[PDB]
Amino acid sequence: TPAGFTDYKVADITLAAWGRRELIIAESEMPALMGLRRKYAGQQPLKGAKILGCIHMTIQTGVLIETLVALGAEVRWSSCNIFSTQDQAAAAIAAAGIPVFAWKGETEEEYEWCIEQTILKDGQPWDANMVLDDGGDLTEILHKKYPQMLERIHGITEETTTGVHRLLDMLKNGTLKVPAINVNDSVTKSKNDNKYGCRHSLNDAIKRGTDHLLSGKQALVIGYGDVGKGSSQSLRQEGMIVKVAEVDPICAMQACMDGFEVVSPYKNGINDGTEASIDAALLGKIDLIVTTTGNVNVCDANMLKALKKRAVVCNIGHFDNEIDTAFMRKNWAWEEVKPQVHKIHRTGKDGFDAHNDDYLILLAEGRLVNLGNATGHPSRIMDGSFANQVLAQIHLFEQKYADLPAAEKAKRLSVEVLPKKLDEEVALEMVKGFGGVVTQLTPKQAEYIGVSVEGPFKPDTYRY
Amino acid sequence: AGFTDYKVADITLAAWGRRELIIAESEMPALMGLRRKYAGQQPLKGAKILGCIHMTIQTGVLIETLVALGAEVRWSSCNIFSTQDQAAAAIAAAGIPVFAWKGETEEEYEWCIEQTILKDGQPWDANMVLDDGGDLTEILHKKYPQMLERIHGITEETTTGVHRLLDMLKNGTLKVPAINVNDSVTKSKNDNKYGCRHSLNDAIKRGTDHLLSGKQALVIGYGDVGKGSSQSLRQEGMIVKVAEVDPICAMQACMDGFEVVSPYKNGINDGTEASIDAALLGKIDLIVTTTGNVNVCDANMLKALKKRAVVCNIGHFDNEIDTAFMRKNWAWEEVKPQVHKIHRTGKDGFDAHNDDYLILLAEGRLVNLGNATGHPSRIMDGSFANQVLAQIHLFEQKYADLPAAEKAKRLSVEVLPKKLDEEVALEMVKGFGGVVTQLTPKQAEYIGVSVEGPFKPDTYRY
Amino acid sequence: GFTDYKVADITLAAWGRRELIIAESEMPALMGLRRKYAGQQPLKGAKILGCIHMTIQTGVLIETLVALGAEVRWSSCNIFSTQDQAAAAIAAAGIPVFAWKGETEEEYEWCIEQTILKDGQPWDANMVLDDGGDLTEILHKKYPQMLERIHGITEETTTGVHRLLDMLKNGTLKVPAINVNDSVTKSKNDNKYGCRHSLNDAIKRGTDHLLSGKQALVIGYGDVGKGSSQSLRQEGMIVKVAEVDPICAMQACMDGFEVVSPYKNGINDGTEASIDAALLGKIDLIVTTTGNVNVCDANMLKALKKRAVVCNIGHFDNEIDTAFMRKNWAWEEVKPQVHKIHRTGKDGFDAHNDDYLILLAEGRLVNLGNATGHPSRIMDGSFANQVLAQIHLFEQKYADLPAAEKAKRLSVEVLPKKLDEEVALEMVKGFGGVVTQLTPKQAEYIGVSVEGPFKPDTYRY
Amino acid sequence: AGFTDYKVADITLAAWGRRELIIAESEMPALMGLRRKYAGQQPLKGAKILGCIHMTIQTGVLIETLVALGAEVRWSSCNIFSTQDQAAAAIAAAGIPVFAWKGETEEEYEWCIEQTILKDGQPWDANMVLDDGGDLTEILHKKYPQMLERIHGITEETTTGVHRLLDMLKNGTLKVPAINVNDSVTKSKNDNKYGCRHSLNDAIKRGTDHLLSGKQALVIGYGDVGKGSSQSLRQEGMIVKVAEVDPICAMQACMDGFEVVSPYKNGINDGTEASIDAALLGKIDLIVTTTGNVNVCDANMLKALKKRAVVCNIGHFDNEIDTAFMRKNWAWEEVKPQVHKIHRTGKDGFDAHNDDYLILLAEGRLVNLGNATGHPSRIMDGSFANQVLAQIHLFEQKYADLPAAEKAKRLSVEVLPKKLDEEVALEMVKGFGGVVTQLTPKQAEYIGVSVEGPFKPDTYRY
Ligand SMILES: NC(=O)c1ccc[n+]([C@@H]2O[C@H](COP(=O)([O-])OP(=O)(O)OC[C@H]3O[C@@H](n4cnc5c(N)ncnc54)[C@H](O)[C@@H]3O)[C@@H](O)[C@H]2O)c1
Ligand SMILES: NC(=O)c1ccc[n+]([C@@H]2O[C@H](COP(=O)([O-])OP(=O)(O)OC[C@H]3O[C@@H](n4cnc5c(N)ncnc54)[C@H](O)[C@@H]3O)[C@@H](O)[C@H]2O)c1
Ligand SMILES: NC(=O)c1ccc[n+]([C@@H]2O[C@H](COP(=O)([O-])OP(=O)(O)OC[C@H]3O[C@@H](n4cnc5c(N)ncnc54)[C@H](O)[C@@H]3O)[C@@H](O)[C@H]2O)c1
Ligand SMILES: NC(=O)c1ccc[n+]([C@@H]2O[C@H](COP(=O)([O-])OP(=O)(O)OC[C@H]3O[C@@H](n4cnc5c(N)ncnc54)[C@H](O)[C@@H]3O)[C@@H](O)[C@H]2O)c1
Ligand SMILES: Nc1ncnc2[nH]cnc12
Ligand SMILES: Nc1ncnc2[nH]cnc12
Ligand SMILES: [K+]
Ligand SMILES: [K+]
Ligand SMILES: [K+]
């Protein structure tokens, strides 16, 4: 009896049985992912693939991990957020002999150490050759601290909008060292996960964090991209009176037409940095503000100062700097209600009255509230995102960028999206998971609209 | 005084039409902002526009915006049933040639387009085309190629019109460049979707006055029009099922809370009655086609529909339903204009109290324009501000005057730049009293955009 | 050689008949009563004065009464609510009807009198069917003698019920009545769901305004206000709700509406200072639904956003201070039942004046004024009750009974819940719904009969 | 600290419970307004209240309101799974006898009620009863008639409890008057409907994390609870069908845009598998019982449900689902607390990867309280304001002190006056920032009401 399998760090390995029970259910909610697991078990298309994975260690990610593993891959995994892991999921994965370094409630130190444990196997760089990322933190660390490892990696498959944006910055600046597939912009990812996932999981997380009635109350959603669209619907369908802020007038136009009043935190929309710019009458009526932008400081200090007493503040974008929580740590006393729920007392820094009425309620300390305060998106939604993740991993691994002459590396050095035909094939398995029946074009019909009977049914410019 | 160059139902409707145009102007801030911004420059001075789009009150404000910016125009409707006669009469009384009335025959429809093309029996000195559906575009290519030599461009309104332009382009038959106005977000995701949300249940109420809540609807298609049409019915309380051939669109319908079904067992349309899901169709109270495709509500479907179901089409062309089969096999009883009971008992005559009929709206033509007034002004504001910008752009490019070599480089179908799309959107938002936030310089840097936009890459789907 | 009618255009009859035949397929409860009671002829000998909106739906009610044996003489209960093809179709069937769309106030009162009189002198009516009590009022206040041979009244709507109860409490009510409104298959089915269907319907026909994204103020949140609010919200309007009833305001909140008052702090003190001018200057659409008086008052009308739409879906047109508007501001007809009210003055207006309001149906019932009111499948519920109520009062034969033994009969009563359920069951079947049948053990467990009624009369649904 | 008259799961949870109570107080303006209105008057001084209701944070605020008004209480939960342990712990820590934890056995549940009834082995000097579901009321009548002699009244929270009260009255077995708290509109239409709207999908998400959008639900019942439950699922995008025995309620579901179906062919429950609509049941992903009835999701429906469907009950008692059949016949795999997979492959063990199972939430117990936290504070504010008023009213009536002749005249089940209902409503509305309009004198005269209310007759249904 030796030490045994120890290449992992989780909160509690004994939760594994529970995580496995939840993985087994989740499999039945993920027909596109499990169809790939079935269709590709033979080809072992990921045999020899050695995947650095950095994405929220949820049950849904566990079904993704095991699908890569079932297709031949070796993986070393960490979560991409300190609060997003489900400890029973992490424990279930570690119990299956898979290296995972993830728990709910990491410090920032532990977060970076966890990523480090995927990168280093046994004190030396693992011979990684694939990267799966969500937000780009693992991507950044590899480029800035382990560039030599990038010499052996065939590509990066990036999950989310913020991560894609960081990739494009690096592509533009000549600093991206390996090609990448933008998974986010599949329609079965962006207009499934980003919108409908937040529709499901935002009011989920707010109810779990606060158990606040939402009906009848006033919400301000900052942003009306895919996340903001889904977020606004999560709140409006519960009966909130939802107001939407935007910098993109096309997105603002959509919110008006979807039945929202479009407002700005600042008078005439001009954020001059002074308190006098804040629409105090507006913020003084808001019971809930949700940031969804991917931007920085969209719920700033002066807004926080002016919010209605006891309003709930949260962020469902990727990074916590959407809210100026730094200002609130410096100036206001924090009272933990329960994990990932704090009352922030605007009375001052040092201590608070337990019955002070002048406080805000912050969820997940500003981190992604759906994963921090609930369980993120549901399996049937994540099915689409992770089916794309698997297809993209298969494809970049087969391309073998790491094995090519230097000058064709410039030709392969690109951020690409999966082809629409693949997008549609994932869509079809999703629809069938609902019991939906897709109609087949007749040849005359296909000829009439200029498509093949088998698709793709839309040009790449089609917006859906 | 002395203006006679027009054909409308009743010129005495002009004072009424004018009252409604003055109202609609207040509902169209982007179109009216363009009028104010460009009146001094006269960017369309010398433009001579053949226009073929639904002669509604909203098209009136478009027409008069083009004119106010310097253009002369000759106008026809792009559907036999979509004209509002008071709008046509107001435009005629303003001295603008228009050939349009509600309830044209097909022959009269073709004649009206020809009256825009010919002036005093001769080709008009047109140099710009504004089209909706491509009917005018097609006539110019097939019958008046010499006129296209002097035409600088086509600004095409609708998905079906764009598809026909692209077919010409791939075939080398497109003679002048086009702007695809449909693909602006302030057109496609405003007009196509939200316009149909507003005007679909509108037309069905005017046509039948049927309660929709609690009743079963089948929407064929879940593109932009299908999405908005589904919402039109679901927000009224219908139980809406959606059919699609595009699994991505089907997936959206699922996620939007709709059951996705096919008219055919396992979705396999093999032309046989036996393929029809008769249990499904025998429960449907309302079928709506939204596809731009052919025969998506076919004869066997029509045979299987529940008795007294409503049948309608909000796509551009009436061949979405097999109305030919119904004319050939079944007796038509007019309820009122644009509303027919179609008795499945036979062709010759019908029992006035027969229970086995369907209710066809607008004879299968676009139901929102045929049985109501189409999209509202505040929505058409976006589409038609795009039209004006597109006319301004193609006219100023002066393709017809370019040397053959330069024409060849410019013969394409293009969309308006995102910056303009955004500028139209902003005026619309301002028309709701919305307040767009300005990025600080730091945030624009953070997300990699200018403070003034555009805010999204062209790949962004919204 | 039938001449005992007055309609706009009798040549519309064939059109009206086509819509009647369609409506019949949309009214299974009414048509069910036709087949159920055709044999019995329960209204044989009934002579019914009827005063209710002369729509296609009312036509099906009329011809249901006749199919069951009744003779009727009919008029509308609003000057703008008649559908002229419905009136014409009824007249063409040899049924006396006096109604057109767009009557004057004078002609409305003349049409009622023509039902009351037959061949120059009072009809020998023995039944009354009323929608707002105007006909009832005229029989009590001007024909207190015809009332002696009538076996009852059946009042259709909330307002008219209220007017009967003020007579009851004051002991001035003279024949027994049946409140048809308090049936759930009438009250909810109609007052709420009917306005859900027909309010935005009317606003679109009248204005063709996009509603999505715009600001509405619904005054009132009773059944009409509830259905009105949903009609606008389901279109994407941002709807605010005003109420004096905190319980209805509570429901508006819970339904996801912001509850506001036109007056600062809700205190309507008659001054221009009390008006929340900031709120009113943002409102694109105000809809009154209260049955009360002056809930959209002159000061609110002054403060409304330019080009706002103003309408009333309550029974009477004093909900809005239209009188102030006639006295002070110039009216421009856009088209029938649509007027631009110019706040620049009374002495004419500039055609391009931007400071105007849009008033629908001159403040009258907007859904019947600018569209066709409620749909057949909804009116089915109310009129099936009306038929049952007429049957019950006719067969009870009040006018043929001892003097004040009839005091045990003098009452405003509702219909038995079992009847309410029977109507509801026919309506559900019209949707193809399938009602589940309790097992004996189940019915014992909750203490009801397998046959119903399933709720006590206190249940609020 | 000397105080030991309680039993909770973990007393160290008290500080957490207290933090959540302080927050809930800010969400319960009506309850906290009663506290401020009556604190000086101490209208419950001398009241000794047996309370049996879900020992949540919201009930914690109610308990402390009663105490603040002068009452002493002894408390138990009315369901084995509904206690929030941190709420129980905070109440115990304040020196208030409470016997409640999440996860009780049935025997523990009974013991907890008895610990409120008995103090130091003898009947407590109880003189008021606050009940939710009738269980404490039942035990008092069956087992402690001597105590009822001294009790002035029962304030019953929920529909099922009121029914048992009415049966006892009808039978002559009710020993003390009761106030039906459920029947206030600020209870029935606030709590029963909008509460289950909030908390049903809440519980289902916490329990299963299943996507609901796009999936098929069958809700049994369309009363207040069923109305709220149907809305809870539809607003998430479920395709919701509704079953009912009451045709009026089914009519409401139709008009609300739901398809109305029966588990049984033509609605006829004949007791055999042959009478099951297996085609319908084979499509349902989620069934919710809302009836207060027995066996409304019976063994033959459970056999017929689509594989892996979720089964749950939001009615007061767990016999709405034939969970007893499932225990006799099928294998239960606990996923996590209050979530069980129920394997239809047999009674003895299961394949860990069997696909033919159902998901039962809270073992058939009220799912909103069992798998989440029940209704939110701002909703329970209305219910519990009514409780406090009902307790005040009966305690001051002092029925137990009246002569036998006066008792006979007051032995009834009453509801609170509408005026009070409105006063609770006004406080709830103010908590939303709502501004109620005050009638003018002439307006109040016009509709025949006082300016202060009541505004509706008692027959008004809202
Ligand atoms: N929590 C989740 O589960 C989840 C899921 C997907 C994506 N995300 C993250 O959410 C963020 C947004 O993702 P997306 O796909 O919606 O991106 P997006 O680009 O589609 O939307 C962002 C929107 O925010 C608007 N915006 C930016 N700055 C603003 C400001 N100052 N005020 C108001 N609006 C402003 C932009 O105009 C844009 O429309 C990204 O960080 C993404 O990674 C989170
Ligand atoms: N009536 C109006 O006011 C109005 C407004 C805009 C566009 N249109 C017209 O409506 C039509 C649709 O326009 P769009 O913008 O929605 O186009 P779209 O391409 O966005 O949507 C059409 C959809 O139909 C689906 N479809 C095709 N064949 C089908 C079949 N046999 N069964 C089921 N689904 C099928 C396609 O997959 C596609 O998603 C076009 O003719 C367009 O010109 C009408
Ligand atoms: N147009 C239609 O088709 C139709 C149908 C049914 C009834 N009605 C009429 O509509 C009106 C309302 O009917 P209902 O059934 O809704 O009655 P209701 O009593 O159910 O509701 C009216 C509401 O108005 C509120 N109210 C009164 N004065 C107010 C004020 N000053 N400010 C705000 N709210 C105020 C009351 O509190 C009440 O809740 C009546 O005149 C009725 O006859 C019209
Ligand atoms: N979980 C909660 O938080 C909560 C809240 C309030 C009440 N409740 C409980 O929920 C139950 C329902 O309460 P309610 O206020 O809605 O009562 P309700 O009387 O308003 O409605 C119950 C409905 O069930 C219907 N029904 C009965 N048997 C049926 C069957 N076999 N099939 C279909 N429908 C059937 C009835 O017709 C009725 O409309 C009661 O037990 C009540 O105590 C629970
Ligand atoms: N009202 C309208 N006018 C012109 N074109 C349209 N297309 C759709 N609705 C229209
Ligand atoms: N269509 C209609 N017919 C008769 N009375 C009505 N009241 C409301 N709508 C009506
Ligand atoms: K229009
Ligand atoms: K009607
Ligand atoms: K709670």
Short mmCIF file of N, CA and C in Angstrom, two decimals, chain D residues 255-302:
data_model
loop_
_atom_site.label_atom_id
_atom_site.label_comp_id
_atom_site.label_asym_id
_atom_site.label_seq_id
_atom_site.Cartn_x
_atom_site.Cartn_y
_atom_site.Cartn_z
N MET D 255 -57.41 30.33 -21.24
CA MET D 255 -57.31 31.75 -21.54
C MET D 255 -55.95 32.29 -21.18
N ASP D 256 -55.27 31.67 -20.21
CA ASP D 256 -53.92 32.06 -19.88
C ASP D 256 -52.89 31.52 -20.84
N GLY D 257 -53.31 30.78 -21.86
CA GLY D 257 -52.39 30.31 -22.87
C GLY D 257 -51.78 28.95 -22.61
N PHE D 258 -52.40 28.11 -21.78
CA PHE D 258 -51.93 26.76 -21.58
C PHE D 258 -52.85 25.79 -22.28
N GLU D 259 -52.26 24.71 -22.77
CA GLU D 259 -53.05 23.59 -23.25
C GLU D 259 -53.51 22.76 -22.06
N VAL D 260 -54.80 22.40 -22.04
CA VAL D 260 -55.39 21.69 -20.92
C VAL D 260 -55.56 20.23 -21.31
N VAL D 261 -54.95 19.33 -20.51
CA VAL D 261 -54.90 17.92 -20.84
C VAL D 261 -55.29 17.09 -19.62
N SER D 262 -55.57 15.81 -19.86
CA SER D 262 -55.76 14.91 -18.74
C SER D 262 -54.77 13.76 -18.81
N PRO D 263 -54.24 13.29 -17.67
CA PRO D 263 -53.42 12.07 -17.71
C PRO D 263 -54.18 10.88 -18.25
N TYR D 264 -55.51 10.92 -18.15
CA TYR D 264 -56.37 9.80 -18.47
C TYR D 264 -57.11 10.09 -19.76
N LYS D 265 -57.30 9.05 -20.56
CA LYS D 265 -58.04 9.19 -21.81
C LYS D 265 -59.44 9.70 -21.51
N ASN D 266 -59.81 10.80 -22.18
CA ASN D 266 -61.09 11.49 -22.01
C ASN D 266 -61.33 11.86 -20.55
N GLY D 267 -60.25 11.99 -19.78
CA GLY D 267 -60.31 12.37 -18.38
C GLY D 267 -60.89 11.34 -17.45
N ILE D 268 -61.01 10.09 -17.88
CA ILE D 268 -61.72 9.07 -17.12
C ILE D 268 -60.69 8.18 -16.43
N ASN D 269 -60.53 8.36 -15.12
CA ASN D 269 -59.61 7.57 -14.30
C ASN D 269 -60.35 6.30 -13.90
N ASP D 270 -60.20 5.24 -14.70
CA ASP D 270 -60.88 3.99 -14.38
C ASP D 270 -60.02 3.03 -13.56
N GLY D 271 -58.76 3.37 -13.27
CA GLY D 271 -57.92 2.56 -12.41
C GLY D 271 -56.98 1.61 -13.12
N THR D 272 -57.04 1.51 -14.44
CA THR D 272 -56.17 0.61 -15.17
C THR D 272 -55.14 1.40 -15.97
N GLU D 273 -54.05 0.70 -16.32
CA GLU D 273 -53.09 1.26 -17.26
C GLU D 273 -53.73 1.60 -18.60
N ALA D 274 -54.83 0.93 -18.94
CA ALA D 274 -55.47 1.18 -20.23
C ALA D 274 -56.00 2.60 -20.32
N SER D 275 -56.42 3.19 -19.19
CA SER D 275 -56.96 4.54 -19.19
C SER D 275 -55.90 5.62 -19.11
N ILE D 276 -54.62 5.27 -19.16
CA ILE D 276 -53.54 6.25 -19.12
C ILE D 276 -53.25 6.72 -20.54
N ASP D 277 -53.16 8.04 -20.72
CA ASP D 277 -52.64 8.65 -21.95
C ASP D 277 -51.12 8.50 -21.93
N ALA D 278 -50.66 7.34 -22.39
CA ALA D 278 -49.23 7.05 -22.35
C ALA D 278 -48.46 7.90 -23.35
N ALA D 279 -49.09 8.23 -24.49
CA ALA D 279 -48.44 9.08 -25.48
C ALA D 279 -48.16 10.45 -24.90
N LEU D 280 -49.12 11.01 -24.17
CA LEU D 280 -48.90 12.29 -23.52
C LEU D 280 -47.88 12.16 -22.41
N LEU D 281 -48.07 11.17 -21.53
CA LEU D 281 -47.19 11.05 -20.38
C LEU D 281 -45.78 10.70 -20.81
N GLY D 282 -45.64 9.97 -21.92
CA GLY D 282 -44.31 9.67 -22.42
C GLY D 282 -43.55 10.87 -22.95
N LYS D 283 -44.20 12.04 -23.06
CA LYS D 283 -43.56 13.26 -23.52
C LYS D 283 -43.24 14.24 -22.40
N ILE D 284 -43.69 13.99 -21.17
CA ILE D 284 -43.58 14.96 -20.08
C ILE D 284 -42.22 14.81 -19.39
N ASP D 285 -41.49 15.91 -19.24
CA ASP D 285 -40.22 15.93 -18.53
C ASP D 285 -40.36 16.32 -17.08
N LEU D 286 -41.51 16.89 -16.70
CA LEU D 286 -41.69 17.49 -15.39
C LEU D 286 -43.16 17.45 -15.05
N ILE D 287 -43.51 16.82 -13.94
CA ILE D 287 -44.89 16.88 -13.47
C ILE D 287 -44.86 17.49 -12.08
N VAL D 288 -45.77 18.43 -11.84
CA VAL D 288 -45.90 19.12 -10.57
C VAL D 288 -47.35 18.96 -10.10
N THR D 289 -47.53 18.47 -8.87
CA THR D 289 -48.85 18.38 -8.28
C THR D 289 -49.09 19.60 -7.39
N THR D 290 -50.31 20.16 -7.48
CA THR D 290 -50.64 21.42 -6.82
C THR D 290 -52.04 21.38 -6.20
N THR D 291 -52.62 20.20 -5.97
CA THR D 291 -54.06 20.11 -5.79
C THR D 291 -54.52 20.17 -4.35
N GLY D 292 -53.71 19.71 -3.40
CA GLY D 292 -54.29 19.44 -2.09
C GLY D 292 -55.15 18.20 -2.06
N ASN D 293 -55.16 17.43 -3.14
CA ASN D 293 -55.97 16.23 -3.25
C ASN D 293 -55.06 15.02 -3.04
N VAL D 294 -55.60 13.83 -3.28
CA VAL D 294 -54.85 12.60 -3.04
C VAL D 294 -54.68 11.86 -4.35
N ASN D 295 -53.46 11.36 -4.59
CA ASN D 295 -53.21 10.45 -5.70
C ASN D 295 -53.51 11.11 -7.04
N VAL D 296 -53.09 12.37 -7.20
CA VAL D 296 -53.28 13.05 -8.48
C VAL D 296 -52.12 12.79 -9.43
N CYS D 297 -51.04 12.18 -8.94
CA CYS D 297 -50.01 11.58 -9.78
C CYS D 297 -49.92 10.14 -9.29
N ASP D 298 -50.70 9.26 -9.92
CA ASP D 298 -50.92 7.94 -9.38
C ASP D 298 -49.91 6.95 -9.95
N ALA D 299 -50.00 5.70 -9.50
CA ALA D 299 -48.99 4.70 -9.85
C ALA D 299 -48.92 4.48 -11.35
N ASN D 300 -50.07 4.53 -12.04
CA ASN D 300 -50.10 4.27 -13.47
C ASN D 300 -49.53 5.43 -14.27
N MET D 301 -49.69 6.66 -13.77
CA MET D 301 -48.97 7.79 -14.36
C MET D 301 -47.47 7.65 -14.13
N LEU D 302 -47.08 7.28 -12.91
CA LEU D 302 -45.66 7.11 -12.61
C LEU D 302 -45.05 6.05 -13.51
#
